[PDB]
Design a protein around this ligand. Structure first.
Ligand SMILES: [Zn+2]
Lengths: 177, 147, 131, 69, 101, 305
C-alpha cells in the first residue's frame, strides 16, 4: 500500500523538486539492484513468484514514477539519471519477470514510453508472457488481492468540484505529464 | 459452538474420529454394512480380475488423493498378477493398492493372520479362502467380510 | 534368471464355485515326489485333465508398463504368465519341502525334494506356463 | 384425476389416448392388452399409464357449485 | 475467456509436470469417461483416471501421469483434440449412411 | 488405436427410419461414446416447451399450477433452431423477445346446451366446450414472428391431448411463454419419448443340437431366432437381432451346458422416438454434434493455474 502511495505521490505532486524525485528513483533502483543481486538465485528454487510480491510492488512504483516524470530523468547531456536505460532492461529480463506480475495497464504504459525513449524494450517479453498464458506460478487465492492492491492509486484525480480546483496548483493531471 | 475453546473440544475430544472403540468393552462401533459386505465378498473373490483400465479406475475413484492424505503426491500401483497372455490385476490387489496409498510410506505394511465368516468348503476343494492373510500390507489370501 | 522348471501332468481341474478360475492338481513327469496345486484364470488359459504343462518359476524376465515397439522378454517363450509372491515355506518331511505362492489371490502350492527346489526363495517371482 | 399428458417414464404423449381407449373396450369389445397395442403403447412404461388410469375427475365434476341441481 | 472451468490442483502436480490433477466444473461421467478413454490411448501416458468427488457438486477430477516424453498438460490437450476428431469421424460416417440409405 | 483405424471399422445400419421413430445400429464403437450420445439425446438436445404460464382466470376444477404443469408437458411442434436462448439476468421486460419466446393463449368458457337430446350422458351434447384440448392453444405471433412463422404456425405435436374439463359457468384464460430448454433441467424439454440402446444378441451354440433337442432348444427363443436346418437336422441361429435375451434356455438343464449367451459387444442397437418436434435422425445428429462441441469448447479454453 505504501509503495502504491509512494509511486502515486511522486508522480502527481506538482510542488516536488527535481532532486526530491531523483531521490526516490535513486532509492528504488538502488533497493531494486540489491534485490536482484541477492535474490535472483531463489527463483529456480522451491516456492512461487509470490515470494517476491515486494519486488514487483517496488518495481511498479518505479515504473509508474517513470511514466509521469521520464522527461525529468534526462540530465543536461541527454543521459539518464540512475542509468535508467541500462537499469530497466536488466529487471525486465531478470528471472522475476516483473512485466508478468505487476499491474497490466502500467506495465503496458511503461513499455510504450520506455520503448519510445530508447530506455527499454519489453514488448517481446510481453508477447511471450500472454502466449505462455494461452497455452512462475502463483496461487490466485492470494494472487488477486495483489492485483487489487496494484490497481489502486491513492492520488489518481479527484472528483469533488471545489477541492479539485483547490488542488490544481498541487496536481499534475496525466495530460500535463 | 461459538468460540475457539469449544471448537478445540469438538475437534479433539468429542469428535467422531477417535471414537472407533466403545468404552463399554473396547470394541469397534464403526464399520460398513449391507451392499458393502456383499460387494467385498465379490470383489475379493479369486474369480475377480481387472484390466489395467479398470484397476486404475477403481483406485482413483476411491482414493481421493486430492486430500489431507497426500501420503504421496503421486498414486502408486502394483504390477499385474498375470503378465501374459493379457495384463490382469486381482481384487485382492485393489485392496493392497488402497492400503499402499493411504498408510504411511515411512512405515512397513500391516501383518495380519485372521479369519472370515465363510468356511473353505464353500469355495471348493483345497480352498484356503477362509484364512485372511496380510503380509507386508498385501492381501495374499482370503476374502474380506463383515468380520 | 530361471529358478525352476518341470513338465507337469494335470490330474484334476476343479472349477469350484467360480467360472473363470480353476484349481489344478498336477504331478511332475520327471520327479516322483514333485507335485503342484495352482489356481488359473482358465478363461485366458483353458486346461483339461491329462494336459501336459511346462511350468517355470523365474526371478525376472530377460517396472511394468504396457508392451511397446519391439519389447522382448522371457514371457515370449510361453502362453500364460503370472506375477506373485512367495509367502510361506514348510518342511513336509525329512526329505521334502513345499513353497506357497500367491498371485493376487490365485494360490500355488509346489511340493518337491529340497534339492530340486533349492533356488526358490521367499521373494517375488514370475510364473510361466506353456502347453 | 384426469389422464396424464405424458407417460412418467417414456416421456411419450398419452393424454390423447384415454377417450379412444374407452371406446375400444366399449365399442370394439377388445381386451385391455389388445386395445393398448392398437393405440401404440408398446413399452410397459406406457401401457401402465392408460391401463391403470382412474378418471376420478368424472366424480369431482358432479359437484358443480355453479348450477341449480 | 473463461478461467473458472478447468483448474490445476497444484497439490498433486509434480515439479516436472509429468503428473497432474485437473478439476473441471460442470462435467460428469459423460465427458470424463470419454476423455480418459482417449487419453489412455496416448502411449506416453503412464496413468489416467477420472473421478467425481460428489454427485451434488458439479465437479470432475482428471489425473494424468506421463512416462516423461510429454507433460501432463500436453496429454490433456492431445486427448481433447483426439476426442474432437473422433466425433468428426462419427458424424461423417453417420451422414454417409443416411445419404446412402 | 488411431482415428483412421476407427473410421475403417465403424459402421452404421439403419433398420427403420420414420418421422417419429428410428431403429439403427452403431457397430464397433466404444460403450463410453454410445452412452454419451444416449445421455445427450435425452438430456441436452434443446427443445421448445411452455415455461411461464400467466393466468387471468381459471374457475375450473383443476388448480392453476397443475394446469400450468400439463401445458408445459405438451410437446410443441417448433423447430428449436428458429429460436435463440433467453438470458435470465435481465428484468422481465427485456427478458422476452421475438427471438426468445413463443406466446400461446387459451380462452374457453363453458355454457350449458339447450339442444341436448333429453336423457343424454355425453358431455359434448350436454355442454359447449366441456373438453379443452391442446389444439385449443392459439398461437399468437409477436413482432417479426408474423413473418418468420408464417410458413409454420405453432401447433402442438399431439393435438388431441386432453388438457382440462369444464362445466357450465367455468372459464379458463391464460397466456403461456414458451422458450428453449434442455431435458437435464426439466423433462418437459426432453425431445424424446425415449432414446435407449441394447447390445446386440450373440447366441453361440457350443456343440451341435439336433432332433428332438433341436425343436426343444428352438422354442426357448422367440419365433424366427433359432432355425432347424434340413439335412444336418442340427439347430443354428437365424437372426439374433430378433432375440429378447430372456435367458429362457438357461432354465432347462439339458441346454444350460451347451449354450453361451453374449453380445456383439460394442454393437449397439439404438431406438430413438421423437416427442414430435424434430425427426429422430435430427435429434441423433444434434447429439453427435453436441458431444463434439464439448470437446472443442474445452480444447479452446485456457487452463487457469
Ligand atoms: Zn409409458
Amino acid at each position: 500500500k505504501s509503495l502504491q502511495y509512494l509511486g502515486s505521490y511522486i508522480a502527481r505532486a506538482k510542488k516536488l523538486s527535481r532532486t526530491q524525485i531523483i531521490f526516490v528513483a535513486s532509492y528504488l533502483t538502488s533497493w531494486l539492484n540489491r534485490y536482484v543481486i541477492e535474490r535472483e538465485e531463489e527463483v529456480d528454487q522451491r516456492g512461487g513468484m509470490e515470494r517476491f510480491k515486494h519486488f514487483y510492488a517496488a518495481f511498479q512504483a518505479l515504473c509508474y514514477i517513470f511514466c509521469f516524470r521520464h522527461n525529468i530523468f534526462r540530465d543536461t547531456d541527454g543521459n539518464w539519471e540512475c542509468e535508467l536505460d541500462k537499469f530497466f532492461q536488466r529487471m525486465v529480463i531478470s528471472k522475476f519477470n516483473p512485466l508478468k506480475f505487476c499491474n497490466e495497464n502500467v506495465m503496458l504504459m511503461f513499455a510504450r514510453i520506455a520503448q519510445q525513449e530508447s530506455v527499454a524494450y519489453c514488448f517481446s517479453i510481453i508477447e511471450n508472457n500472454n502466449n505462455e498464458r494461452l497455452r512462475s506460478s502463483w496461487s490466485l487465492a492470494t494472487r488477486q488481492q495483489f492485483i487489487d492492491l496494484q490497481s489502486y492509486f491513492p492520488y489518481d484525480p479527484l472528483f469533488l468540484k471545489n477541492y479539485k480546483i483547490l488542488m490544481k496548483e498541487y496536481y499534475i493531471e496525466w495530460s500535463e505529464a | 459452538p461459538q468460540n475457539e475453546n469449544a471448537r478445540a473440544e469438538a475437534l479433539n475430544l468429542a469428535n467422531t474420529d477417535s471414537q472407533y472403540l466403545t468404552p463399554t468393552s473396547g470394541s469397534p462401533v464403526r464399520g460398513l454394512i449391507q451392499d458393502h459386505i456383499s460387494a467385498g465378498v465379490w470383489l475379493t473373490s479369486k474369480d475377480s480380475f481387472f484390466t489395467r483400465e479398470q484397476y486404475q479406475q477403481y483406485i482413483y475413484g476411491c482414493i481421493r488423493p486430492e486430500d489431507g492424505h497426500t501420503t504421496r503426491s503421486k498414486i502408486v500401483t502394483l504390477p499385474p498378477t498375470i503378465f501374459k497372455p493379457y495384463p490382469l490385476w486381482t481384487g485382492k490387489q485393489i485392496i493392497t493398492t488402497v492400503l499402499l496409498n493411504v498408510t504411511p510410506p515411512d512405515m512397513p505394511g500391516i501383518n495380519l493372520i485372521s479369519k472370515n465368516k465363510i468356511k473353505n468348503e464353500y469355495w471348493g476343494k483345497g480352498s484356503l479362502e477362509n484364512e485372511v492373510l496380510f503380509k507386508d500390507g498385501a492381501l495374499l489370501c482370503g476374502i474380506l467380510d463383515k468380520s | 534368471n530361471t529358478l525352476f522348471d518341470d513338465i507337469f501332468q494335470v490330474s484334476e481341474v476343479d472349477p469350484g464355485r467360480y467360472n473363470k478360475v480353476c484349481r489344478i492338481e498336477a504331478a511332475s513327469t520327471t520327479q516322483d515326489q514333485c507335485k503342484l496345486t495352482l489356481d488359473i484364470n482358465v478363461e485366458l488359459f483353458p486346461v483339461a485333465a491329462q494336459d501336459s504343462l511346462t511350468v517355470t518359476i523365474a526371478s525376472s524376465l530377460n517396472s511394468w508398463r504396457p508392451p511397446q515397439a519391439g519389447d522382448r522378454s522371457l514371457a515370449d517363450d510361453y502362453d500364460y504368465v503370472m506375477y506373485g509372491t512367495a509367502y510361506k515355506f514348510e518342511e513336509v518331511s525329512k526329505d521334502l519341502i513345499a513353497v506357497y505362492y500367491s498371485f493376487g489371490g490365485l494360490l500355488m502350492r509346489l511340493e518337491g525334494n529340497y534339492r530340486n527346489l533349492n533356488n526358490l526363495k521367499q521373494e517375488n517371482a514370475y510364473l510361466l506356463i506353456r502347453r | 384425476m384426469i389422464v396424464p399428458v405424458r407417460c412418467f417414464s417414456c416421456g411419450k404423449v398419452v393424454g390423447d389416448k384415454w377417450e379412444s381407449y374407452l371406446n375400444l373396450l366399449q365399442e370394439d369389445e377388445l381386451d385391455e392388452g389388445t386395445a393398448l397395442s392398437r393405440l401404440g403403447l408398446k413399452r410397459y412404461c406406457c401401457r401402465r399409464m392408460i391401463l391403470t388410469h382412474v378418471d376420478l375427475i368424472e366424480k369431482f365434476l358432479r359437484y358443480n357449485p355453479l348450477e341449480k341441481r | 475467456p473463461d478461467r473458472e472451468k478447468i483448474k490445476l490442483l497444484t497439490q498433486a502436480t509434480s515439479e516436472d509436470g509429468t503428473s497432474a490433477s485437473f478439476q473441471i466444473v460442470e462435467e460428469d461421467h459423460t465427458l470424463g469417461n470419454a476423455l480418459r478413454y482417449v487419453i489412455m490411448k496416448n502411449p506416453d501416458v503412464e496413468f489416467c483416471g477420472y473421478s467425481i468427488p460428489h454427485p451434488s457438486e458439479n465437479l470432475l477430477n482428471i489425473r494424468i501421469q506421463t512416462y516423461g516424453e510429454t507433460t501432463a498438460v500436453d496429454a490433456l490437450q492431445k486427448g481433447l483434440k483426439d476426442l474432437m476428431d473422433l466425433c468428426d469421424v462419427v458424424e461423417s460416417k453417420f451422414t454417409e449412411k443416411i445419404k446412402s440409405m | 488405436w488411431n482415428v483412421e483405424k476407427f473410421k475403417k471399422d465403424f459402421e452404421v445400419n439403419i433398420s427403420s427410419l420414420d418421422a417419429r421413430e428410428a431403429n439403427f445400429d452403431l457397430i464397433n464403437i466404444d460403450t463410453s461414446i454410445a452412452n454419451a450420445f444416449r445421455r445427450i439425446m435425452i438430456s441436452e438436445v434443446p427443445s421448445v416447451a411452455a415455461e411461464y404460464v400467466y393466468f387471468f382466470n381459471n374457475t375450473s376444477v383443476i388448480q392453476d399450477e397443475v394446469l400450468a404443469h400439463r401445458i408445459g408437458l405438451v410437446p410443441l411442434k417448433v423447430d428449436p433452431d428458429m429460436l435463440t436462448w433467453v438470458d435470465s439476468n435481465l428484468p422481465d421486460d427485456e427478458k422476452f423477445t421475438d427471438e426468445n419466446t413463443i406466446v400461446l393463449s387459451l380462452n374457453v368458457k363453458c355454457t350449458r346446451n339447450p339442444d341436448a337430446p333429453k336423457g343424454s350422458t355425453d358431455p359434448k351434447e350436454l355442454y359447449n366446450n366441456a373438453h379443452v384440448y391442446a389444439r385449443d392453444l392459439k398461437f399468437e405471433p409477436q413482432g417479426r414472428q408474423s413473418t418468420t412463422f408464417a410458413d409454420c404456425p405453432v401447433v402442438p405435436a399431439d393435438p388431441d391431448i386432453l388438457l382440462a374439463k369444464l362445466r357450465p359457468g367455468q372459464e379458463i384464460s391464460l397466456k403461456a411463454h414458451c422458450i428453449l430448454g434442455i431435458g437435464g433441467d426439466h423433462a418437459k424439454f426432453s425431445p424424446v419419448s425415449t432414446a435407449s440402446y441394447r447390445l446386440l444378441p450373440q447366441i453361440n451354440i457350443l456343440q451341435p443340437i439336433k432332433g428332438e433337442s433341436a425343436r426343444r432348444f428352438q422354442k426357448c427363443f422367440p419365433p424366427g431366432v433359432i432355425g432347424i436346418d434340413e439335412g444336418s437336422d442340427e439347430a443354428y441361429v437365424k437372426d439374433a437381432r430378433k432375440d429378447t435375451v430372456s435367458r429362457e434356455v438357461l432354465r432347462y438343464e439339458e441346454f444350460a451346458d451347451k449354450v453361451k449367451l453374449g453380445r456383439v459387444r460394442n454393437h449397439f442397437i439404438f431406438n430413438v422416438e421423437s416427442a414430435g418436434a424434430m425427426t429422430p435422425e435430427e435429434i441423433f445428429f444434434k447429439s453427435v454434434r453436441i458431444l463434439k462441441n464439448k470437446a472443442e469448447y474445452l480444447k479452446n479454453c485456457p487452463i487457469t493455474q
